[PDB]
Design a protein around this ligand. Sequence first.
Ligand SMILES: *[C@@H]1O[C@H](CO)[C@@H](O[C@@H]2O[C@H](CO)[C@@H](O[C@@H]3O[C@H](CO)[C@@H](O)[C@H](O)[C@@H]3O)[C@H](O)[C@H]2NC(C)=O)[C@H](O)[C@H]1NC(C)=O
Ligand code: NAG
Ligand code: NAG
Ligand code: NAG
Lengths: 725, 193, 110, 111
Amino acid sequence: QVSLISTSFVLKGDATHNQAMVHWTGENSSVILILTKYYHADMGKVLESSLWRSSDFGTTYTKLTLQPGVTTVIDNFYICPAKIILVSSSLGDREQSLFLSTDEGATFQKYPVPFLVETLLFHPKEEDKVLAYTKDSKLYVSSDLGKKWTLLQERVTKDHVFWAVSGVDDDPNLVHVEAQDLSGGYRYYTCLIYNCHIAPFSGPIDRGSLTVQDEYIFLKATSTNRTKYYVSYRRSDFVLMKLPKYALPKDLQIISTDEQQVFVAVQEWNQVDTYNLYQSDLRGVRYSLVLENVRSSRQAEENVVIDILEVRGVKGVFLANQKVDGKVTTVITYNKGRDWDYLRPPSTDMNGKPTNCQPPDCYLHLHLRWADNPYVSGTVHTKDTAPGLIMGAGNLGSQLVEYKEEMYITSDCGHTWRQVFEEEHHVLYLDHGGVIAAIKDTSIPLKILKFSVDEGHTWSTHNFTSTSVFVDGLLSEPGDETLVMTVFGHISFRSDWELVKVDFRPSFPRQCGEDDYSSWDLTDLQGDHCIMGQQRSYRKRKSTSWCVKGRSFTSALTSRVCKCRDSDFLCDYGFERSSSSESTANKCSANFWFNPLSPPEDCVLGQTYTSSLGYRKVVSNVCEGGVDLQQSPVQLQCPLQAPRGLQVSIRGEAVAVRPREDVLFVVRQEQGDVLTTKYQVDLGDGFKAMYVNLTLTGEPIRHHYESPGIYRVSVRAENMAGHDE
Amino acid sequence: AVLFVQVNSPLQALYLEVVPVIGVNQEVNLTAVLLNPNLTVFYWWIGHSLQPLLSLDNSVTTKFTDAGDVRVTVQAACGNSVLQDSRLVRVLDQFQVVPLRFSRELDTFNPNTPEWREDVGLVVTRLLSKETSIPEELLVTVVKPGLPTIADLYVLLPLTSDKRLAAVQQALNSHRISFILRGGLRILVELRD
Amino acid sequence: HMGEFSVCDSVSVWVGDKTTATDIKGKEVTVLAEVNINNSVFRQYFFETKCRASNPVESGCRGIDSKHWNSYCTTTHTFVKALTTDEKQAAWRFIRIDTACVCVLSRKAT
Amino acid sequence: FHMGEFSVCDSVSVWVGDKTTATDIKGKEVTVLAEVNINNSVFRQYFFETKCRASNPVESGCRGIDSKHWNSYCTTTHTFVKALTTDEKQAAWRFIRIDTACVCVLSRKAT
Ligand SMILES: *[C@@H]1O[C@H](CO)[C@@H](O[C@@H]2O[C@H](CO)[C@@H](O[C@@H]3O[C@H](CO)[C@@H](O)[C@H](O)[C@@H]3O)[C@H](O)[C@H]2NC(C)=O)[C@H](O)[C@H]1NC(C)=O
Ligand SMILES: *[C@@H]1O[C@H](CO)[C@@H](O)[C@H](O)[C@H]1NC(C)=O
Ligand SMILES: *[C@@H]1O[C@H](CO)[C@@H](O)[C@H](O)[C@H]1NC(C)=O
Ligand SMILES: *[C@@H]1O[C@H](CO)[C@@H](O)[C@H](O)[C@H]1NC(C)=O
């Protein structure tokens, strides 16, 4: 029927327990490294370890030795990204060292460290460049693979240091840092590989610097009664992000700054349960509503999780779990968030008795990122590696529960779902969705293994081991175009570890030809082919063919275009939709707090702003424009600004003032700067003085009071538009 | 030996809550919203006189014998930090007061942020002016801080004021004055008996 | 075939759909489906593990010196504290839960 | 006492009120609370632990083994109990590993 090989191996060391790390080295190398480490609780944090290396698909592991008492390798041993180099870290009471390899861990050379260590981080492309986070919160760097070291920063924050993108920004030697300045200041620095200071905007943050490797940079400005959040696109000047003025945020998290725009989640009302999903434009400023409610938890102390999954196989496909009242429902969108809908039930299994759910009153639901129930040991997952393939565990009805989890799969990107397994199952993909392997996720050991080569329509069972094993993890050879699988866990009767190599290549040793595929046109839940303005059709491997989809995969070969429609436009910032689903079309009306007549921020006299009508084309929608609700109003104007938000303050924290002292005064506005603005000033002691463009200076003015006592300072901002005090 | 100590180091923000308009000889229930227990230091600058009033409580109650514009300032220094907020209010004499009912649904989306309340009152005033053709700056809407959303409208003069009152009454009752709060959510405003 | 055999064949399963059980005193009690503690709702999950069969082979347990011994497999027994009710009062009672399958012997008379 | 002479392996039971440390299902060592508060009622975490006395009750591992064809040894098995424990951060009703019985393991010999 099929043809494969399976080989088990036990780490020969009898003294094996506690934890372990398994990692491949580069693509198509057949070399695996493992660190078997022994932890200690009760504030000990001590480690004892051994090192293992396999140079043959993980079928034979050699215990790598060193001459003295075996080195206490600590936690992260890590490889060089992209270019094979290995680094191992070692802890002592106060002492430290390092080990470096250039031949896949065959010859580890020893080097010393002139500082402590907590973690490391390589450069995405530079092979010999790597920085080091030092336990006492420091940041060192090295361009010679860590043989020697120099110092960059001294008060960095935990896991808020980044490298500049190598593909973007055209400069690859930058180091972005979130570091504590002075006493209780947090700033954003940018240094280079040699030395340093603050090129972009910098203010106060409470540990919230976030830079996704795409074009965006973000900032969390904590303030006095209302907080702010800033964005920087293509390393431009920082701009306050446009959130609803009165739909107030408590906390927020960047869901996806992937592809063209920004997806953020913002918890408005403190239900401690739900978030709202907002979407921006290409610049990442104009945020509009997309999804109403989503689950939200907090496993780690300061880390939260939000139930949403973006299918990378098709740009613009999202799945999300909403929590309304007490019901957790699953919804999907192909319109990149414009319209969402439920998942279609299969109504078939081994016994497809149609007493199961029909469309009208109960659909299909999936546990995306949350496993409520205890017996499952591994983290829950719904995977989306291949285009059109989405496999995951869930319920089948009106909401999700903890009791019953069934493994469903879809091969046409949500349109057709099918039920496969009872209970949850670890899933591993091979050959860009060519082979799907499943292992029951539970606390009981097992010896079975499910696998399917036809996208979950026919599975086969295999005894991959002899003694029953606790399943800890599934890994694949890097690239995922291969067909080599690695299973690892500790067996039942004894505690020693066990790994299993699985090789499906004996059944797939041939390359797929262009005639080894069948057609599959992309539709949605409505049978419409114009998705994102583009009719797409993909290829699916023939059932009567045993071939490899290849190092490079051919997808979306049949591409046709459509003209734009009302379904290709959503509301702009501050506009909302009327009525309900399958009723009134996309009518975006302006809500009350803001009106599109208002001028934009910083319209200097001379410029001409363009008012908006409340609609915008779906970002990444490639429909034929020209006609079909382009809605270019051609409304050009700009008015003179009026003085508002006038506030006078004293520089710093001079809570008490002494007579004959350099007292510094600063005045600020909020509604632009008109180039003819009068600022009258009385300093309470008869000092009359009128100035112009005080906010243009930004620097204080000195004054010295003669008599001890109380005074009232009055400032008047005046134009030909209004007056403020 | 005795030593009294107090422990309230950080102060975040303050805000002075006061209605924008009230008549002469009326008691004003000024509130000083601050970050705090009964340990609170409050300096109150009610008017022109320098000498500030001392208070441990958030609220004070005062009057105004004169009309016009009054500067009301409040300063808070519980620990070693100084916060201060000011507000200018109008004291009138020629006006008519109208109570205003809002729809109940608005309550479920009503934060007491004074700027939200300001924008709501401004929207109500705009709609009143658009449905009565009367001057817009002579209509002041204050929607209160209470949990149930209740508004009060001040209608100024600078007779014909009876017909203006009747015009607003017809604008609210005979035609229901509508308000688009949230997408798919419409609020209505009418009279509060 | 090979590897490491268990002397008796066991069957493990998690049970969240628990309705009835037997308490420590021997009275049939009713296990509540869900528990409320600190406004958190838990499902009563119990890990049960019984025997697959009392005769894995012809001579009772597997791998016994049958020439001089008689053998048979039997289920184990432990107690778990769970929120139950006895048709009258709801309380946190201890209930009987299976955990393993063990072989027991008896000397054979040649 | 229809069991027989003895079990194939030497078992020993005990009730543990002195529960301080344990290992959860995820493999992390946690600290066990001494007492539990539910509503206003205070309980104590008692655990019923049954383990082995020895891995070789006789010379050929387990008691009553056809050692001419098998190798044997006794080992302690377990189950998971939902108990109120805590880590360095938060306390929760975690499932921890508790010994509950003693079993025998066999392996085929080479004739
Ligand atoms: C700072 O700004 C915040 C909003 O960001 C203001 O917080 C809100 O203040 C109102 C008025 O005090 C709170 O409503 C109150 O609720 C209590 C019940 O807890 C009720 O008894 C009162 O009658 C009043 O309605 C509201 O909960 C609070 N929070 C939010 C999210 O709106 C605050 O007033 C501002 N203050 C300062 C000093 O900056
Ligand atoms: C392999 O597993 C199958 C299904 O569980 C079972 O029928 C068969 O006996 C097993 N074989 C071995 C050698 O374990
Ligand atoms: C001020 O408000 C408080 C709170 O309702 C009330 O007890 C008091 O009577 C009010 N005083 C005046 C003069 O309105
Ligand atoms: C604070 O002290 C004042 C004394 O004037 C008293 O009236 C008030 O009830 C006290 N409030 C609290 C919360 O103790």
